């Protein structure tokens, strides 16, 4: 089962067409993995390697191979809750990204930024909701979060 | 009056009977050292380096001794307050005790966590409170917070 | 009017008068300059290496330059949302000071501190508000926040 | 190829037998895979999640499963060059188990060590050889290096 | 002078055809600036947030710009010594493209690499020369070094 | 034994007069600690959180208190071996001085440095000794190393 469940994700990731965490775990589910849940599709995206990229119809999705990957391609999920926006990235990248979007700054909603190895913690300024920070950086991404 | 202390202090790890912060800043008080706090006894199970065992009797206690260390073992603390669960650990431990924590993901509740030296911020889904992620914390790391 | 900038912003520095990035925002306006905002100003603080001292007058201010630089010097800005108060620093600076202030503990109002290269997070004990959290913080750091 | 490369490298850690990477290379060059070396070994254990564990025969050995897990039992690799001594963890755990390392100290042989995500870099003083220092630190962790 | 040297610096990088710090050096040097060096150039470069970019002659050279940007691009400069190949980097992107590197492994000739914030320690096997392992890295990201 | 052993070693400290590791060694050695070593001094430091400060006669010595604290006074050694020179700092203070070296660059003879939480790396350019750099670094440090 582990190992067509591995099968499975990898393939998704080679049509090169799936944007977001959220649409693998429905394409996986469809496929009869009913336990499969985001923190899976997460822990998975690590283990393989994942990386995003701009396909031949202009979205932004998920592929399998990295020294040309770009910032914008090393971002897995953009999320939030209440009180921050919180970024997902590929293995030792969420500081590089962090540097840059703490340059933004207040003036563009971002109070704060502080990144841990592959998170990405935005905390935003009293003038700017969550949830339009969470857009913004969405439009930066380009991530259908 | 702070060589009373630390000596003290010292004694109740070895008695390796405590389970919480609390518990310390309690048994010091009862002692006689009325002005003991929570800051003073963080600062003092990092300062002499202690971590945390099962006992014999299977609780989960404060000791003074670490290679053979476990990473629950190196949990000082958890804590939480409206938006965040608070975890303080032994120095230099909390980027690995994160590394697990965000890999249980947003299926278990966790948003995202990053890491300082000796601490780590656990933010919550907008799926589960804060108080139920903090009693989850606590039961992963058997501390009674 | 890149150049201006520039000449001008150091120019404020060299003054050693101003305390806060919101005070070099309003005399840059107050030049001409009608585009500026704390974004500009912050990247500008960085890229130039300004650090902060005490002036002649006893009044902490900004300064155009660092081996005898303390780490009060090294905080550029303190402010805050209403869940975190947040402390922007020179650049690799924020890991010492977190050290600093996450020993000060709960007791003083701090649950836990984190810190990204030149950003820190300090998040409130349930005991103190952000508000007055960020006043002891700014009072510790003699900013005009 | 692969597919059977991976199921070949899983079964060997759930053998809980194989105490070095020179071990798993031996072994999967002897069940056929020619081109296997140990720059495919160890991207296998950080990509699989291995960890060391002490077997019932009272050898430390790969397994695959991590928060019951021991700093010694986070050591993937232990080899060197003529100046320094190389260990090689699981994720993340490199801080943790440099920050026992450099305690040990000059008395030690260890003038200094420097960590990065998953590699420890040990310098030694002038007293020790390198080889001395890794045979101490194959000892420390109980690698057969 | 010093507003000079800026000005002519950042021209330098806006011909985007310097591929290597020495080449910078001597430009500026034929200029007149009689008393550059790299140490003048690597802080201008890290002041300025220099990158690469592969031009159309298909050269790599820097650039005065950053999302969309590469690891390699992300590369300043590529030097050695007698145990060492030390890279320096943009700010903040020296971990992970220290990840990518420690990927590669001893097989390839690398022991081991660590990271600092803009600066790479790659140390190599026994059976690779320090000369070698400068001319592969070189390579892999086409510095003229 | 311990009890005196701290006693005599914070008196040491209080005395305001020592300027080096070494010499701290001594003067225990000749109180009666026979078995005193650097290893068992430099934990002192770090644990007791030790600084550096200029006496009133001009010198560098260690004293027992910090958010006044410069740069120069985090360092607590400077050392070396044929191939690095190493530097120990307070707790947390490594990445903040080493970018302050690594800005030092080629032309001062540093090819590169890297930082781990309390140590520093610096390795020569081919045109500096390793003895004539930890000279440089020593009087920059004003450390009698």
Redesign the interface.
Known sequence: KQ?NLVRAFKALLKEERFGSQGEIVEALKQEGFENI????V??MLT?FGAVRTRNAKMEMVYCLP???????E?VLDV??????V?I?TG???A??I???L???????GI???????????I????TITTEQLFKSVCE??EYAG
Request: hydrophobic fraction near 35%; glycine fraction near 8%.
């Open positions: 190992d849940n985001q923190s899976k997460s822990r283990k990295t020294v040309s990957s770009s910032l914008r090393l999320d939030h809750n209440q009180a921050l919180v997902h293995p030792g990248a500081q590089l962090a540097r840059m703490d340059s933004l700054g207040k003036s563009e109070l704060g930024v502080v990144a841990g190895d592959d998170t990405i913690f905390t935003p300024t009293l930066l991404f």
